[PDB]
Symmetry: none
């Protein structure tokens, strides 16, 4: 069980998996997730992913609780920090 973030729509391009936690921009970058990059993600059923527009869990928040082949044009390429919960 992990969250996998994808570069492109429909789980395309580069992908990186992360365990529960609170990831800043620099921490995402270390994990090989660039800024303004996430377009789709897989979420284990039961889990919650809070995707933030700005670093340090600020700016607009989008919430995902299931596999999302397309985040939509509002949330697309905006993830700069993220909180992942196994609940």
């Amino acid at each position: 069980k992990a969250v996998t973030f994808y570069e492109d729509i429909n789980y395309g391009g580069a992908s990186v998996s992360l365990q529960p936690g609170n990831y800043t921009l620099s921490q995402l970058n270390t994990a090989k997730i660039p800024n303004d990059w996430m377009s789709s993600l897989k979420v284990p059923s039961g889990w919650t992913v809070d995707v933030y527009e700005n670093d340090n869990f600020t700016g607009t928040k989008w919430t995902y609780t299931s596999d999302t082949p397309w985040v939509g044009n509002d949330a697309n390429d905006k993830m700069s920090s993220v909180k992942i919960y196994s609940t």
Copy 2:
């Protein structure tokens, strides 16, 4: 208080240990309490308590959650505690 979370240097509650009350402890604060970085390998948790262990300082990076006595955190979580939140409920 006598009830506390006890963190251990080695697997199976081995080596040096440090007990902490509920709170939110950064890296420097852990160090002050005599817990070095990347050091924790096992821990004891009072019933009803929650321990959120964080890979990085300031409660960021991967988070491992413990609600019971844990003789071994696992190789992925091993020697990676850099900050921690302890809850009494």
